[PDB]
Short mmCIF file of C-alpha atoms and ligand atoms in Angstrom, two decimals:
data_model
loop_
_atom_site.label_atom_id
_atom_site.label_comp_id
_atom_site.label_asym_id
_atom_site.label_seq_id
_atom_site.Cartn_x
_atom_site.Cartn_y
_atom_site.Cartn_z
CA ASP A 1 -14.13 -20.39 10.49
CA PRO A 2 -15.14 -18.15 13.56
CA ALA A 3 -13.49 -14.69 12.21
CA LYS A 4 -16.33 -14.99 9.37
CA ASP A 5 -19.19 -13.30 12.05
CA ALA A 6 -17.43 -10.23 12.96
CA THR A 7 -18.64 -7.27 11.28
CA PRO A 8 -16.43 -7.11 8.19
CA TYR A 9 -13.86 -4.22 8.43
CA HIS A 10 -11.44 -2.58 5.96
CA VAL A 11 -9.78 0.89 5.45
CA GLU A 12 -7.86 2.34 2.96
CA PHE A 13 -5.48 4.94 1.53
CA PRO A 14 -2.38 6.18 -0.44
CA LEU A 15 0.44 6.60 2.22
CA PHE A 16 3.80 6.63 0.19
CA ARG A 17 2.81 9.80 -2.69
CA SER A 18 4.40 10.35 -6.28
CA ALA A 19 5.35 13.84 -6.94
CA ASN A 20 2.16 14.40 -9.35
CA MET A 21 -0.15 14.08 -5.98
CA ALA A 22 -0.92 16.95 -3.63
CA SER A 23 0.57 15.67 -1.05
CA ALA A 24 3.82 13.77 -2.20
CA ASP A 25 6.03 12.72 0.51
CA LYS A 26 9.45 14.41 0.19
CA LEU A 27 11.94 14.51 3.42
CA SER A 28 12.77 17.13 5.94
CA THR A 29 15.52 18.32 3.51
CA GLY A 30 13.65 18.32 1.07
CA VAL A 31 14.12 15.70 -1.03
CA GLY A 32 12.03 14.38 -3.13
CA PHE A 33 10.59 11.18 -5.09
CA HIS A 34 9.39 10.55 -8.65
CA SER A 35 8.01 7.49 -7.72
CA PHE A 36 7.80 4.90 -4.61
CA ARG A 37 7.84 1.46 -5.44
CA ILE A 38 8.86 -2.22 -3.79
CA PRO A 39 6.93 -2.05 -0.37
CA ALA A 40 7.71 -4.19 2.65
CA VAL A 41 6.11 -4.08 6.04
CA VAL A 42 6.54 -5.45 9.19
CA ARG A 43 4.18 -4.80 12.95
CA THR A 44 7.17 -4.78 15.42
CA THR A 45 6.92 -6.36 19.27
CA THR A 46 5.96 -2.71 20.56
CA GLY A 47 2.97 -2.84 17.58
CA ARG A 48 4.45 0.25 16.08
CA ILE A 49 4.71 -0.36 12.16
CA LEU A 50 7.17 0.37 9.82
CA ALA A 51 6.47 0.69 6.40
CA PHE A 52 9.66 0.55 3.85
CA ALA A 53 10.20 1.16 0.27
CA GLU A 54 12.15 2.70 -3.01
CA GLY A 55 12.45 6.32 -3.23
CA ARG A 56 12.66 6.53 -7.11
CA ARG A 57 14.21 9.95 -7.12
CA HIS A 58 14.33 10.70 -11.16
CA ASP A 59 11.77 8.22 -12.46
CA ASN A 60 10.18 5.09 -11.95
CA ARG A 61 13.25 3.27 -13.33
CA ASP A 62 14.85 0.06 -11.41
CA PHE A 63 17.85 1.86 -11.28
CA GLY A 64 19.76 4.88 -11.36
CA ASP A 65 19.43 7.18 -7.41
CA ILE A 66 17.20 5.01 -5.34
CA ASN A 67 17.25 5.86 -2.07
CA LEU A 68 15.77 3.10 0.64
CA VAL A 69 12.77 5.36 2.78
CA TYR A 70 10.36 4.66 5.28
CA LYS A 71 7.69 5.67 7.32
CA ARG A 72 6.74 4.71 11.23
CA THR A 73 3.17 4.57 13.06
CA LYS A 74 3.61 7.48 15.19
CA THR A 75 2.99 5.17 18.11
CA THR A 76 3.13 2.21 19.32
CA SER A 77 -0.62 1.73 18.90
CA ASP A 78 -2.33 2.93 16.57
CA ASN A 79 -2.51 0.64 14.23
CA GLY A 80 -1.45 2.82 11.12
CA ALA A 81 -5.17 3.08 11.41
CA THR A 82 -5.86 6.55 9.64
CA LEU A 83 -2.95 8.71 7.60
CA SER A 84 -2.79 11.18 10.88
CA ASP A 85 -1.91 7.70 12.35
CA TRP A 86 1.94 8.12 10.36
CA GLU A 87 4.74 9.99 10.61
CA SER A 88 6.33 11.46 7.26
CA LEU A 89 8.67 9.79 5.30
CA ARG A 90 12.30 9.34 6.80
CA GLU A 91 15.52 7.43 5.19
CA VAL A 92 17.23 4.34 5.95
CA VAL A 93 19.82 4.65 3.75
CA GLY A 94 20.35 6.94 0.35
CA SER A 95 23.81 7.74 0.07
CA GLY A 96 25.30 8.10 -3.16
CA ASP A 97 23.94 7.95 -6.95
CA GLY A 98 23.44 3.73 -6.98
CA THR A 99 20.84 2.12 -6.24
CA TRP A 100 19.52 1.18 -2.85
CA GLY A 101 16.69 -1.63 -2.28
CA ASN A 102 14.98 -4.61 -2.16
CA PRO A 103 13.21 -4.29 1.36
CA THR A 104 13.64 -7.42 3.34
CA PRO A 105 12.73 -6.90 6.96
CA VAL A 106 12.52 -9.53 9.72
CA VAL A 107 12.07 -8.78 13.20
CA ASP A 108 13.40 -10.75 15.94
CA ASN A 109 12.59 -9.53 19.41
CA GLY A 110 14.11 -5.38 19.86
CA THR A 111 15.98 -5.80 16.57
CA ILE A 112 14.61 -5.20 13.18
CA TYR A 113 16.91 -6.46 10.60
CA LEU A 114 16.72 -5.01 7.40
CA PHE A 115 18.47 -6.89 4.17
CA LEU A 116 18.85 -4.56 1.10
CA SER A 117 19.98 -5.21 -2.44
CA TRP A 118 22.48 -2.75 -3.78
CA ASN A 119 24.21 -1.09 -7.30
CA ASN A 120 26.29 0.69 -8.66
CA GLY A 121 24.44 4.69 -10.45
CA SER A 122 25.98 2.94 -13.22
CA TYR A 123 24.47 0.14 -13.82
CA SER A 124 21.77 -1.45 -14.57
CA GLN A 125 20.34 -5.36 -14.91
CA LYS A 126 20.54 -5.49 -19.20
CA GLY A 127 22.71 -3.05 -19.32
CA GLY A 128 21.99 -0.08 -22.50
CA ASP A 129 19.60 2.47 -20.08
CA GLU A 130 20.24 6.47 -20.70
CA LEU A 131 20.14 8.03 -16.93
CA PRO A 132 19.11 11.27 -16.40
CA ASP A 133 22.57 12.51 -17.38
CA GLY A 134 22.58 10.86 -20.62
CA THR A 135 25.13 8.27 -19.27
CA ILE A 136 24.87 4.75 -20.30
CA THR A 137 24.33 1.78 -18.30
CA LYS A 138 26.76 -1.14 -17.85
CA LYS A 139 25.03 -4.40 -17.21
CA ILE A 140 25.21 -6.28 -14.21
CA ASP A 141 28.05 -8.22 -14.30
CA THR A 142 29.66 -10.74 -12.13
CA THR A 143 32.71 -8.33 -10.86
CA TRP A 144 33.48 -6.46 -7.41
CA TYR A 145 32.35 -3.14 -9.00
CA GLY A 146 29.31 -4.46 -11.32
CA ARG A 147 27.55 -6.62 -9.47
CA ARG A 148 24.34 -6.57 -6.84
CA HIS A 149 25.51 -6.30 -3.11
CA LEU A 150 24.33 -8.10 -0.15
CA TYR A 151 23.24 -5.37 2.79
CA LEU A 152 22.77 -5.10 6.15
CA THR A 153 21.30 -2.47 8.58
CA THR A 154 19.26 -2.67 12.24
CA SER A 155 17.44 -0.40 14.57
CA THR A 156 17.42 -1.63 17.91
CA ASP A 157 14.86 1.58 18.88
CA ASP A 158 11.69 0.75 17.13
CA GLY A 159 12.67 1.68 13.53
CA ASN A 160 13.59 5.05 14.95
CA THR A 161 17.65 4.91 13.71
CA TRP A 162 19.22 2.68 11.70
CA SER A 163 23.01 1.51 11.43
CA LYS A 164 24.99 2.25 8.62
CA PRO A 165 24.20 -1.05 6.30
CA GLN A 166 26.89 -3.68 6.02
CA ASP A 167 28.38 -4.79 3.12
CA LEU A 168 27.41 -8.79 3.22
CA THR A 169 28.18 -9.74 -0.47
CA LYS A 170 31.31 -12.29 0.12
CA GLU A 171 29.35 -13.82 3.22
CA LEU A 172 26.18 -14.63 1.96
CA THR A 173 25.53 -13.95 -1.72
CA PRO A 174 27.07 -16.49 -3.70
CA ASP A 175 30.97 -15.98 -5.74
CA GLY A 176 30.54 -15.20 -9.09
CA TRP A 177 26.64 -14.45 -9.21
CA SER A 178 26.05 -10.74 -11.26
CA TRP A 179 21.81 -10.42 -10.54
CA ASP A 180 21.05 -10.15 -7.30
CA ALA A 181 18.16 -9.74 -5.15
CA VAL A 182 16.72 -10.09 -1.91
CA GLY A 183 12.69 -10.02 -0.58
CA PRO A 184 11.16 -8.20 -1.10
CA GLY A 185 8.69 -8.07 0.79
CA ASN A 186 9.32 -9.57 4.51
CA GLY A 187 11.54 -12.56 6.43
CA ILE A 188 10.06 -13.78 9.22
CA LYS A 189 11.34 -15.54 12.58
CA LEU A 190 10.45 -19.31 12.90
CA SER A 191 8.52 -21.29 16.36
CA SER A 192 11.57 -22.81 16.71
CA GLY A 193 13.98 -19.55 17.01
CA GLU A 194 15.59 -19.09 13.67
CA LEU A 195 15.22 -16.35 11.44
CA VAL A 196 14.84 -17.08 7.69
CA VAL A 197 15.02 -14.52 4.98
CA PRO A 198 13.92 -15.29 1.45
CA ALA A 199 16.67 -14.67 -1.43
CA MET A 200 17.38 -14.74 -4.93
CA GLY A 201 17.97 -19.04 -5.46
CA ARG A 202 18.52 -19.48 -1.78
CA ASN A 203 17.41 -18.51 1.86
CA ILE A 204 19.40 -16.23 4.20
CA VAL A 205 19.61 -17.64 7.61
CA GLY A 206 20.04 -16.19 11.19
CA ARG A 207 20.94 -19.13 13.97
CA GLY A 208 21.90 -18.30 17.65
CA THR A 209 19.44 -16.03 19.78
CA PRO A 210 18.16 -12.53 19.49
CA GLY A 211 21.50 -10.17 20.38
CA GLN A 212 23.56 -12.56 19.45
CA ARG A 213 22.87 -14.00 15.98
CA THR A 214 24.64 -15.38 13.03
CA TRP A 215 23.99 -16.15 9.77
CA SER A 216 24.31 -18.13 6.33
CA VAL A 217 23.00 -19.92 3.46
CA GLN A 218 20.78 -22.36 2.23
CA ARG A 219 20.84 -22.99 -1.45
CA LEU A 220 18.00 -23.91 -3.09
CA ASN A 221 17.68 -25.01 -6.78
CA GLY A 222 15.52 -23.68 -8.94
CA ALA A 223 14.00 -20.73 -6.17
CA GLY A 224 12.68 -17.51 -8.29
CA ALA A 225 15.13 -14.53 -8.13
CA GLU A 226 12.18 -12.53 -6.21
CA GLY A 227 10.90 -15.47 -2.73
CA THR A 228 8.45 -15.51 0.03
CA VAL A 229 8.62 -17.70 2.57
CA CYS A 230 6.58 -19.25 5.52
CA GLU A 231 5.86 -21.50 7.97
CA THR A 232 3.13 -23.44 7.23
CA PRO A 233 0.49 -25.13 10.39
CA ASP A 234 2.66 -28.24 9.99
CA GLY A 235 5.42 -26.85 11.17
CA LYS A 236 7.79 -26.78 7.99
CA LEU A 237 8.82 -24.21 5.68
CA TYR A 238 7.16 -22.89 2.20
CA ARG A 239 8.84 -20.41 -0.63
CA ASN A 240 6.17 -19.45 -2.79
CA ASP A 241 7.82 -17.37 -5.77
CA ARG A 242 7.61 -14.99 -8.39
CA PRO A 243 8.27 -17.52 -11.70
CA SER A 244 11.08 -16.62 -14.10
CA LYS A 245 8.15 -16.51 -16.95
CA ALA A 246 3.96 -15.66 -16.61
CA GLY A 247 1.91 -17.71 -15.70
CA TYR A 248 2.01 -19.31 -12.23
CA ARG A 249 3.49 -18.83 -9.01
CA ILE A 250 6.33 -21.42 -8.14
CA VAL A 251 6.25 -23.65 -4.84
CA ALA A 252 8.82 -25.47 -2.77
CA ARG A 253 8.56 -26.46 0.97
CA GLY A 254 10.84 -28.05 3.53
CA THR A 255 13.15 -27.37 6.53
CA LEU A 256 16.12 -25.74 7.58
CA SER A 257 17.71 -29.55 8.39
CA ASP A 258 16.80 -31.71 5.72
CA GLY A 259 16.71 -28.88 3.02
CA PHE A 260 14.11 -28.18 0.00
CA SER A 261 11.75 -30.37 -2.98
CA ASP A 262 12.16 -28.85 -5.94
CA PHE A 263 10.25 -25.76 -6.99
CA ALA A 264 7.16 -26.28 -9.24
CA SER A 265 4.28 -24.39 -10.52
CA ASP A 266 1.01 -23.99 -8.21
CA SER A 267 -1.64 -24.36 -11.30
CA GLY A 268 -3.70 -22.78 -8.32
CA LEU A 269 -2.16 -19.45 -8.32
CA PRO A 270 -2.29 -17.53 -11.56
CA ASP A 271 0.68 -14.79 -11.44
CA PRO A 272 2.17 -12.62 -13.97
CA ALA A 273 5.49 -12.35 -13.45
CA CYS A 274 5.38 -10.22 -10.39
CA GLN A 275 6.29 -10.27 -6.36
CA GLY A 276 3.97 -11.77 -4.17
CA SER A 277 3.33 -12.07 -0.26
CA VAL A 278 2.75 -14.17 2.49
CA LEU A 279 1.88 -14.16 5.47
CA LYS A 280 1.43 -16.72 8.58
CA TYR A 281 -1.73 -15.41 10.17
CA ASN A 282 -2.30 -17.93 13.58
CA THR A 283 -1.13 -20.94 14.68
CA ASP A 284 -4.30 -22.10 16.84
CA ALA A 285 -7.30 -23.19 15.00
CA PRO A 286 -8.30 -22.88 12.50
CA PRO A 287 -4.44 -21.97 11.53
CA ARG A 288 -4.48 -19.79 8.33
CA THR A 289 -1.71 -18.57 5.27
CA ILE A 290 -3.10 -15.84 3.87
CA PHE A 291 -1.19 -15.08 0.38
CA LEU A 292 -1.48 -12.00 -1.75
CA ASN A 293 -0.44 -11.42 -5.39
CA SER A 294 -1.94 -10.36 -9.17
CA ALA A 295 -4.23 -13.31 -9.32
CA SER A 296 -3.44 -13.35 -13.61
CA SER A 297 -1.72 -14.93 -15.82
CA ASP A 298 -1.26 -11.28 -17.38
CA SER A 299 -1.92 -8.60 -15.23
CA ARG A 300 -1.00 -6.84 -12.73
CA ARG A 301 -4.21 -5.06 -11.99
CA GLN A 302 -6.07 -8.06 -10.40
CA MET A 303 -5.00 -8.33 -6.64
CA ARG A 304 -6.24 -11.02 -4.52
CA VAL A 305 -6.07 -11.41 -0.92
CA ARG A 306 -6.69 -15.56 0.15
CA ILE A 307 -6.65 -17.77 2.92
CA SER A 308 -5.59 -21.44 3.25
CA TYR A 309 -6.12 -23.53 6.33
CA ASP A 310 -4.13 -26.49 5.13
CA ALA A 311 -1.34 -28.10 6.92
CA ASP A 312 0.93 -27.45 3.78
CA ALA A 313 -1.02 -24.37 2.04
CA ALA A 314 -1.78 -26.70 -0.57
CA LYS A 315 -4.60 -24.80 -1.21
CA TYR A 316 -6.52 -21.15 -0.73
CA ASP A 317 -9.82 -20.00 -0.83
CA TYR A 318 -10.66 -17.75 -3.34
CA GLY A 319 -10.29 -14.75 -1.38
CA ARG A 320 -11.91 -11.44 -2.29
CA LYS A 321 -10.43 -9.02 -4.77
CA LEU A 322 -8.85 -5.60 -3.49
CA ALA A 323 -10.74 -3.86 -6.11
CA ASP A 324 -13.80 -4.33 -4.38
CA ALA A 325 -12.72 -2.42 -2.03
CA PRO A 326 -11.07 0.29 -4.73
CA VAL A 327 -9.15 3.67 -3.78
CA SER A 328 -9.47 6.90 -5.89
CA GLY A 329 -7.16 9.65 -6.83
CA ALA A 330 -3.67 7.16 -6.63
CA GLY A 331 -3.54 5.71 -9.84
CA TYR A 332 -4.27 1.88 -10.83
CA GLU A 333 -3.74 -0.42 -8.10
CA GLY A 334 -2.22 -3.45 -8.64
CA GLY A 335 1.56 -5.44 -8.56
CA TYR A 336 3.91 -5.99 -5.56
CA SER A 337 2.77 -6.21 -1.83
CA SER A 338 3.53 -6.76 1.57
CA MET A 339 1.81 -7.68 4.19
CA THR A 340 1.77 -8.54 8.50
CA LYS A 341 0.13 -8.80 11.06
CA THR A 342 -1.18 -5.87 12.88
CA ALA A 343 -1.40 -5.71 17.01
CA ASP A 344 -4.97 -4.68 16.56
CA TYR A 345 -5.36 -8.66 14.44
CA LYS A 346 -5.80 -7.32 10.95
CA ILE A 347 -4.21 -8.07 8.09
CA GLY A 348 -1.57 -4.96 7.13
CA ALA A 349 -0.89 -4.85 3.37
CA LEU A 350 0.93 -2.44 0.65
CA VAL A 351 -0.07 -2.58 -2.49
CA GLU A 352 1.71 -1.03 -5.62
CA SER A 353 -0.37 1.83 -7.89
CA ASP A 354 0.69 3.37 -10.95
CA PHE A 355 -0.65 6.63 -12.64
CA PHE A 356 0.09 4.84 -15.99
CA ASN A 357 0.64 8.82 -17.02
CA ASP A 358 3.36 7.62 -18.92
CA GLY A 359 1.74 4.05 -19.91
CA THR A 360 4.56 1.49 -19.56
CA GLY A 361 7.20 4.46 -19.64
CA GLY A 362 9.88 5.65 -17.05
CA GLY A 363 7.26 8.53 -16.77
CA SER A 364 4.35 7.07 -15.34
CA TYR A 365 4.28 7.83 -11.80
CA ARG A 366 4.11 4.76 -8.91
CA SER A 367 2.45 5.55 -5.56
CA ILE A 368 2.35 2.62 -2.90
CA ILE A 369 -1.43 2.33 -1.07
CA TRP A 370 -2.01 1.25 2.63
CA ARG A 371 -4.79 -1.30 3.43
CA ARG A 372 -6.29 -2.99 6.60
CA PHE A 373 -8.73 -5.68 6.68
CA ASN A 374 -9.69 -8.56 9.22
CA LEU A 375 -10.41 -11.82 8.20
CA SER A 376 -14.36 -11.18 7.50
CA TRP A 377 -13.79 -8.81 5.14
CA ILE A 378 -12.02 -11.25 3.01
CA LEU A 379 -14.47 -14.61 4.00
CA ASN A 380 -17.42 -12.67 3.15
CA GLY A 381 -16.48 -11.41 -0.14
CA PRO A 382 -18.71 -12.31 -3.17
CA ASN A 383 -16.95 -15.64 -4.47
CA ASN A 384 -15.53 -17.62 -1.12
O1 LIG B 1 8.61 -5.07 -11.63
C1 LIG B 1 9.28 -5.72 -11.85
O2 LIG B 1 9.53 -6.45 -12.50
C2 LIG B 1 11.30 -5.02 -11.25
O3 LIG B 1 12.03 -4.54 -12.30
C3 LIG B 1 11.20 -4.50 -10.01
C4 LIG B 1 12.16 -4.31 -9.38
O4 LIG B 1 12.54 -3.43 -8.99
C5 LIG B 1 13.60 -5.75 -10.33
O5 LIG B 1 14.25 -5.64 -9.60
C6 LIG B 1 12.62 -7.12 -10.86
C7 LIG B 1 13.90 -8.00 -11.33
O6 LIG B 1 14.01 -7.09 -12.64
C8 LIG B 1 12.74 -9.19 -11.81
O7 LIG B 1 12.55 -10.22 -10.61
C9 LIG B 1 13.79 -10.11 -12.73
O8 LIG B 1 14.95 -10.25 -12.06
O9 LIG B 1 11.16 -6.67 -11.24
O1 LIG B 2 19.91 10.92 -3.70
C1 LIG B 2 20.51 11.33 -2.67
O2 LIG B 2 21.93 10.85 -3.21
C2 LIG B 2 20.65 12.75 -2.20
O3 LIG B 2 20.68 14.22 -3.04
C3 LIG B 2 19.37 12.64 -1.27
C4 LIG B 2 19.94 11.51 0.16
O4 LIG B 2 18.53 11.60 0.59
C5 LIG B 2 20.98 11.97 1.00
O5 LIG B 2 20.41 10.68 1.48
C6 LIG B 2 21.90 11.79 -0.36
C7 LIG B 2 23.61 11.70 0.25
O6 LIG B 2 23.69 12.81 1.29
C8 LIG B 2 24.35 11.79 -0.47
O7 LIG B 2 24.47 10.60 -1.85
C9 LIG B 2 26.51 11.65 -0.16
O8 LIG B 2 26.08 9.99 0.39
O9 LIG B 2 21.94 12.79 -1.29
CA1 LIG B 3 20.85 8.48 -3.53
#
């Protein structure tokens, strides 16, 4: 790998700052957030970077009043290299007291498509949860009013403005589902043109061309609730999903035309039942797939970025622990992540972090770290 020859490079700093932090991120209206979770990042075709998160208004929990917030880099060519290269916090959508979340963007020339999950403010995944006003939630069910919805918003101005989200639940979620999720993290555009957005038990597929996309569903038996997808070097598709119970990632491979294998545990990739991220880095020699998750069967604090050179992404190297370049003052890093390739040939990653001030409870402040590093940084790590 010739990339090893470059001087190793890494920067890291908090980008979404929880309410407890000095420069706590708030909207221009003065609306702030206890916590930020569930990152998604894409570089646009202009080279601008767009970073999305769930703005969790009142506590760190998955339900209640949650707005879909974002930042862009100030210019198309700064690559988010320093804190001062990022705009202040903006909102994609925050209407009502329910949950707007699961950011899953994909870039198509230009247009940015952002798929989202939504639920009503009176419902939660388990039910029986107490909201700040004392209201008790109902469990997410199969009804229209009580199910998880799937929404699509678009930007045709490099993220500056977003269309009113369109509810595509009846079109792109199976009838009779209760819980649902899209991503979270990112979709992909294939070498052959199609858009592929990972979701619970399915891919959401955009055929046609840029400016004239048509969406449909590819069902995937045994896929996770929270999936990732990648075009591997052999031109095939690769789903690398969160398992239903802690242990290992689950993986399937296929195509849009012939469908997917069943899902099987990948014994090379331990996972604690948490979201991960995957990225197609490059197509020429040597081709590389990048993977990032907590490399642990029981902890989310063992973030490890890795590289596979295999045509089918079978096997990864050990890679490097993100703790080798730690951040201070933004909690204990580890959890959900998202990766993009910046216009200056770095990996750009968003990674969750947890102050743990309320332990596992609802009052623990959550922030999101932004990281850039070159392939040399990964490849020159101690156990690679
Ligand atoms: O941090 C988690 O693990 C979390 O709770 C955060 C997400 O907001 C939630 O939608 C997701 C979901 O509960 C699981 O995928 C099981 O369906 O996981
Ligand atoms: O989180 C909310 O609900 C909030 O308070 C803050 C949001 O940033 C804003 O978008 C939203 C909206 O104005 C109303 O919910 C009516 O749609 O008001
Ligand atoms: Ca709201």
